[PDB]
Every structure is written in structure tokens, then in C-alpha cells.
Design a protein around this ligand. Structure first.
Ligand SMILES: C[C@@H]1O[C@@H](O[C@@H]2[C@@H](O[C@H]3O[C@H](CO)[C@H](O)[C@H](O)[C@H]3O)[C@@H](O)[C@@H](CO)O[C@@H]2O)[C@@H](O)[C@H](O)[C@@H]1O
Ligand SMILES: C[C@@H]1O[C@@H](O[C@@H]2[C@@H](O[C@H]3O[C@H](CO)[C@H](O)[C@H](O)[C@H]3O)[C@@H](O)[C@@H](CO)O[C@@H]2O)[C@@H](O)[C@H](O)[C@@H]1O
Ligand SMILES: C[C@@H]1O[C@@H](O[C@@H]2[C@@H](O[C@H]3O[C@H](CO)[C@H](O)[C@H](O)[C@H]3O)[C@@H](O)[C@@H](CO)O[C@H]2O)[C@@H](O)[C@H](O)[C@@H]1O
Ligand SMILES: C[C@@H]1O[C@@H](O[C@@H]2[C@@H](O[C@H]3O[C@H](CO)[C@H](O)[C@H](O)[C@H]3O)[C@@H](O)[C@@H](CO)O[C@H]2O)[C@@H](O)[C@H](O)[C@@H]1O
Ligand SMILES: OC[C@H]1O[C@H](O[C@@H]2[C@@H](O)[C@@H](O)O[C@H](CO)[C@@H]2O)[C@H](O)[C@@H](O)[C@H]1O
Ligand SMILES: OC[C@H]1O[C@H](O[C@@H]2[C@@H](O)[C@@H](O)O[C@H](CO)[C@@H]2O)[C@H](O)[C@@H](O)[C@H]1O
Ligand SMILES: [Ca+2]
Ligand SMILES: [Ca+2]
Ligand SMILES: [Ca+2]
Ligand SMILES: [Ca+2]
Ligand SMILES: [Cl-]
Ligand SMILES: [Cl-]
Ligand code: NA
Ligand code: NA
Ligand code: NA
Ligand code: NA
Lengths: 292, 4, 292, 4
């Protein structure tokens, strides 16, 4: 089954992602195919998939930027029916906004069926153009037609996935304790993490004994990413991935605070030194505490 | 120790 | 012995505190007697006492606001010698900036002797006027003269004192773990804590599931107090007291994040709800984790 | 639980 999470949804036939045109929150804003840049935040192209309780493999798809939902215009089963952003809620019973998402015959891509109409999300004519129509179209679950096949590129981790990434790290102290704060996290490219740091004012902060030392830099970076999350996205039900760790050196006679993020593959953590903005696989400390 |  | 810490130093004879005039960092800025408001931050009247290793009961006194040190002008033993703020360092060997501080004959107030001159800090003529001269003056350790007697009103806690205040609280979960980040903390009046909250932008922040929920408010309040500390004070070697706690309700089925501060007497904690700015003796959660 |  598709898991709850944030997805970048990429056509199987051509390199176009499902894009809410101009990120607009207006009802009836067209959802279109659009090119994308890997290892960036594709601002109009991220979708929060919320499973519907007691409806198998069925989800709402909320655009992270607009907070509006993928909507099949008037629930029509006609081929060519507009797919648009529309106001809604994460657990609506409105079938226009409910989507059954299951693996295609290829077994890696998915098809996206409207729960009401039983028609499929279709990049019309397989057009790779920026702004190409996406429509509800006649189809079947088993056919090869790449107009209706979609790679769900997972951009979020669950708290359980973050927990696993930390646990396989070789710089974790024996006494380590982790404190989880949220459920589902958008993983930032290091380019975006770095931009939040650059914009935070930390690069221009002086290290000062106790009054503005490593713990202040690390907590300030975590607050800066929290603020960025709320300010950047209108959807609810997810957090931005940014951890704080406390660590102790090998000699057990010095401690430090720092941040951490996750690799592109979501399998490992990477340490972030918030005084200088460096990324490190080894920061010179074993983590005894983390909150994220 | 205490994070410095 | 006087312990390392931040003090408000109040004359025993008249209600004048030791004040660095206008908070000025200029060398030779006069230190004067000045009236004060209890349960406020008295901005020019806070002194960081740093013990000198291997010199008994001897300290530098750094003004928290200016970062400059109490200095006996040219180390003169003449009665009437100016006491001024002067550039220095926490562990100087300059005797002009070294002060032996021991209990007076009354046993609650202290006298302040210059280590070089062996003369005493003296509110000249016991004058209660705002801007009254403070001078080095002839004296003895045992005499009653209130011109030379000073109450050291302790405005900071050690991490060990904070740890004790948390431990005597009745809302601590059995699984509680605390993570100490600094050594010595300025305790804020609730009026100042509240002002930092009002100025943080949190009062005008909306609660949003995961993306800006209780953990975001609590970490944002802690960052706001950290920033305020560094921006407000030029001295180093202390932190501002502001904790974050995670707690679980009695039923064990809901958790929350919040802040905490300390009572005026430094003996107990008080919970701070960063969404609404309320102070509470019972926030409806037992703390399982704290960092401060 | 997880702080909400
Ligand atoms: C190239 C083309 O691919 C297929 O046609 C698609 C359409 O396929 C879908 O709709 C048709 C009816 O119009 C039929 O129901 C098919 O099972 C279904 O997948 C559709 O994707 C549109 C819009 O993008 O484009 C093409 O017309 C295939 O059926 C055709 O024979 C032809 O090979
Ligand atoms: C009221 C007054 O109090 C005392 O005199 C103080 C001064 O006391 C200090 O200096 C004198 C010498 O001038 C002497 O060494 C004394 O032991 C010492 O405490 C001093 O505090 C000044 C400046 O504020 O004010 C008064 O002159 C006492 O000796 C006097 O007899 C008289 O009672
Ligand atoms: C917010 C905005 O994002 C970018 O423009 C979006 C655009 O972004 C996609 O397409 C561009 C090329 O047009 C790149 O491939 C990006 O990597 C994609 O993410 C689309 O989403 C369209 C239609 O919705 O809206 C534009 O605003 C970027 O080019 C802008 O500078 C700006 O950062
Ligand atoms: C920063 C400044 O603080 C206050 O003025 C200080 C003054 O503060 C003391 O005296 C006033 C009365 O003059 C009150 O009793 C305060 O409670 C004291 O803290 C002195 O420190 C003088 C001389 O150094 O400097 C003034 O700036 C306040 O009155 C100002 O509004 C302002 O907040
Ligand atoms: O128009 C406001 C509503 O938007 C969504 O429902 C509508 C639906 O009632 C119908 O008009 O068709 C449109 C276009 O397909 C939408 O799906 C919300 O689900 C409603 O609660 C309401 O806000
Ligand atoms: O003047 C700069 C210096 O300030 C402090 O020492 C002086 C001392 O050398 C003498 O000039 O007397 C004055 C007034 O009493 C000061 O105590 C610092 O300790 C020096 O390191 C230097 O910065
Ligand atoms: Ca949370
Ligand atoms: Ca600190
Ligand atoms: Ca520290
Ligand atoms: Ca959160
Ligand atoms: Cl087929
Ligand atoms: Cl006497
Ligand atoms: Na439209
Ligand atoms: Na379901
Ligand atoms: Na002077
Ligand atoms: Na000493």
C-alpha cells in the first residue's frame, strides 16, 4: 500500500510532475504536468497523501504549498474531465477528492483512480510541455499506458524511519536517548537546509561562553527550520526534519550541541555544525541525546 | 560534560 | 564563601544598589549608588562574580550589561579613590579589579575589599541620592559601618540548583530525564519572561497539527530567550533560564511540550504555556524530559 | 505519546 507521506508525483512516460499551477489556492486552479529539478524543493509539486480510514488504498492528496486538494471536477467519468486544486479536508467523504492509489502492472509506478468516477489521472497525450493538461480518463488497473502511470517519489520520513537512520549511525553513545516530537517529516535537500541557515542570521552570530554557545546555535537552527515550515506551506499534518543532538567526545571530557538531517535515500543521518554551516559524517562527538 |  | 553567580548588590544602610552609570562600557565610567525596583531587571546593576583560582574569597565583578569590570582607580589606598567600570578579563591578575568578598560582622551582608589596596567599597557618607559616589575607603572587616556593608542579592541559579527545583516538583514523570546545557543561569522575573514572549511573535502564531504545534512554540520560546540573552548583555559566562519540557497526561494517552521558569526564591519551577503565555503550577502533564 |  502507499504509506501516508509527502510525494513528488512524476509521470512514467515523460519527466513531468503533477503541478498545481502557480501554487494557487483558488478553487478550480488547474493541475498540470510541469518539468522539475531533482534535489530541490519543487514548491508547487509536493502532495500530502492522507489514508482514509476503512476505505482500502484510498487517500486525499493535499498540495503542500496551497493546502488545497486534488479534485475531479464535478466527479464526472467523462474522459477529459478537469483535475484541479479545490478547498477540502484531509478525511473528506467528497468522492471528487478521494483517490485509490495502487501499483501499476510495471509494479514500481502507481495509477491514481478517482474513487467516485473510477477514471484515472491522465497526462493527456503524454505531452511533456510545461502546463500540459491532466484529466480524469477512462482506463484499467492492468494496462501499460504510460499517460496514466505515476512514480510516487517519497520526500518524507515517518518518526520510525528517522529513528532507524539514527540507530544505524556509528557515532551514537551507549547512553543515547531520543525524543520524537512529530509523526511525518519533510526531508530537506542540503541546499534548502543551508538556505534556511543562511537566512537565519546564525552565520553572523559570535560564539560566546554559555550566553550564545553550541546549544544556542543548535536550538536557534531548529527554531529557524520550524518557522520556515509554517511560513512556507499551507498544508497541515507534517513537520520539517531538523534534529538537535547533544554529544560527548571519545575522552568523555568535552560535550557539544549540533544539528542533524537525513541523506537523500532517507537511510542515514548527517551532522550539521550550526556555527559554520558544515555537513559532516563524523562531528567528533557521540550523540547521547536527540530531539526531532 | 555540559554542551560548550 | 560567596558562590560564582550574578548579584544585585544593595547597600545595608540605604536602598541604593551598585550601579555602573548609564551602563557605559567607557573606561573610567563611575560606579555609583542608585535606587532600584525589586522584581525587575535592574539593567545597570547586575554583577557577575567570578572566583579567582588559588586566591581565597577573591573575585572579579563584571557588569552584566557593559562587560566591564569594577576597578579601583590606579589601585590607590587613599580614602575617596574612584571605583569605576574598566576593561578587563574574568581571571585577571590586575589587583585593581580583584575584590575579596566576605561576610560582615552582621553575618548577612558582605564587605568588598580591593585585593591590592586592602580598602573597602564605600557608599560615601551613606548618601541615598541617585548618582552618589562609591569609593575605596579605609576600613576593617569587623566594624558595623553601613557605608561599607552590602547585601549580595543572588539573581542566578547553578545547574545543580535548577536540577533541585525540578526534582521537588510534584508533576515529574517516573521516566523523567533532564539534559543540562549551561552552568549558571540568570533567573528572569515573570514580567521580563512575558515581555520576551510578547516580543517573540509567538502570541500571534496559530497552532497547526505537527507543522507549528506545541513543540514548535516551546522551542521558539527557548530560542527567543537565547537571542534576548546574547543581544541584551555584553558579559560572558552565564545563560538565561528558560527550559523546555515534554510531558504526558495522567491517562498516558496524550503528550505536550511547554516551557518552565523558576520562582523568585529559586526553589521551585513554574510551567509556561507558550501558545497563550499563561504561568501554571499544574499544566495537566507530568514531565518526562527537560532540557535547559 | 508524541507531543501534539
Ligand atoms: C497511444 C494510445 O494510447 C492509448 O490511448 C490513450 C488513452 O488511453 C486511455 O483511454 C482510451 C480511450 O480514449 C482507452 O480507454 C485506454 O484503455 C486508456 O488507457 C489516453 O491515455 C489518452 C489521453 O492521454 O491518450 C491516448 O489516446 C491506447 O488505447 C491507444 O490505442 C493508443 O495506443
Ligand atoms: C558616621 C561616621 O561613620 C564612620 O566614619 C565613616 C567612614 O568610616 C570609614 O573611614 C573612617 C576614616 O574616614 C574609619 O577608617 C572607619 O573605620 C571606616 O569605616 C567612611 O565610611 C566615610 C565615607 O562614607 O563616612 C564616615 O566618615 C565612623 O568612623 C565615624 O566615627 C562616624 O561615626
Ligand atoms: C516558486 C517558484 O518555483 C519555480 O517556478 C515554478 C515552477 O517550478 C517548476 O518548474 C521550473 C521551471 O519552470 C523548475 O523546473 C522547477 O524546478 C519546478 O519546481 C512551476 O511550478 C510553475 C507552475 O506551477 O510555477 C513556477 O512558479 C522557480 O522557477 C521560481 O523561480 C520560483 O522559485
Ligand atoms: C535601561 C533603563 O533602565 C532604567 O534607567 C536606568 C536607571 O535604572 C535604575 O534607576 C531607575 C530610576 O532612575 C529605576 O529605579 C530602575 O528600576 C533602576 O534599575 C539607572 O541604572 C541609571 C544610571 O545608571 O541609568 C538609567 O538608564 C529605566 O528608568 C529606563 O527607562 C531604561 O529602561
Ligand atoms: O465549492 C466548495 C466545496 O468544495 C468541495 O466540494 C465541491 C463539491 O461540493 C462540488 O461543487 O464539486 C466541486 C468541484 O468538483 C467540489 O468537489 C468541498 O469538499 C466542499 O466541502 C465545499 O467546501
Ligand atoms: O587601560 C587599559 C588596561 O585596563 C586595565 O588595567 C588598568 C591598569 O593597567 C592601570 O592603568 O590602571 C587602570 C585604572 O585603575 C586599570 O586597572 C586592564 O586590566 C589592562 O589589561 C588594560 O586592558
Ligand atoms: Ca508535535
Ligand atoms: Ca548556552
Ligand atoms: Ca552550553
Ligand atoms: Ca511540530
Ligand atoms: Cl497494455
Ligand atoms: Cl563597629
Ligand atoms: Na479551472
Ligand atoms: Na484506508
Ligand atoms: Na571617570
Ligand atoms: Na578563589
Amino acid at each position: 500500500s502507499l504509506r501516508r507521506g509527502i510525494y513528488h508525483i512524476e509521470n512514467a512516460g515523460v519527466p513531468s510532475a503533477i503541478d498545481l499551477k502557480d501554487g494557487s489556492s483558488s478553487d478550480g486552479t488547474p493541475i498540470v504536468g510541469w518539468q522539475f529539478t531533482p534535489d530541490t524543493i519543487n514548491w508547487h509539486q509536493l502532495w500530502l497523501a492522507e489514508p482514509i480510514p476503512n476505505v482500502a488504498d484510498t487517500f486525499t492528496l493535499c498540495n503542500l504549498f496551497s493546502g488545497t486538494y486534488m479534485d475531479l471536477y464535478n466527479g464526472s467519468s467523462e474522459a477529459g474531465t478537469a483535475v484541479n486544486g479545490w478547498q477540502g479536508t484531509a478525511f473528506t467523504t467528497n468522492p471528487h477528492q478521494l483517490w485509490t492509489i495502487k501499483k501499476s502492472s510495471d509494479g514500481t509506478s502507481y495509477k491514481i483512480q478517482n474513487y467516485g468516477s473510477k477514471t484515472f489521472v491522465d497526462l493527456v497525450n503524454g505531452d511533456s510541455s510545461d502546463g500540459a493538461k491532466i484529466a480524469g480518463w477512462t482506463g484499467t488497473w492492468d494496462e501499460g499506458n504510460p499517460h496514466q502511470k505515476w512514480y510516487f517519489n517519497r520526500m518524507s520520513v515517518s518518526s520510525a524511519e528517522a529513528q532507524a537512520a539514527i540507530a544505524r549511525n556509528p557515532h551514537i553513545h551507549g547512553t543515547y536517548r531520543g525524543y520524537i516530537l512529530d509523526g511525518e517529516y519533510l526531508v530537506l535537500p542540503n541546499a534548502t537546509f543551508t538556505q534556511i541557515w543562511k537566512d537565519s542570521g546564525l552565520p553572523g552570530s559570535k560564539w560566546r561562553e554559555q550566553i550564545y554557545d553550541c546549544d544556542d546555535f543548535a536550538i536557534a537552527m531548529k527554531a529557524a527550520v520550524g518557522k520556515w515550515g509554517a511560513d512556507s506551506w499551507k498544508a497541515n499534518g507534517f513537520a520539517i526534519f531538523c534534529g538537535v543532538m547533544l554529544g560527548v567526545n571519545k575522552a568523555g571530557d568535552a560535550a557539544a550541541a549540533y544539528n542533524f538531517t537525513l541523506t537523500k535515500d532517507h537511510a542515514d543521518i548527517v551532522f550539521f555544525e550550526p556555527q559554520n554551516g558544515g555537513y559532516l559524517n563524523d562531528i567528533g562527538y557521540d550523540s547521547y541525546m536527540a530531539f526531532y | 560534560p555540559v554542551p560548550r
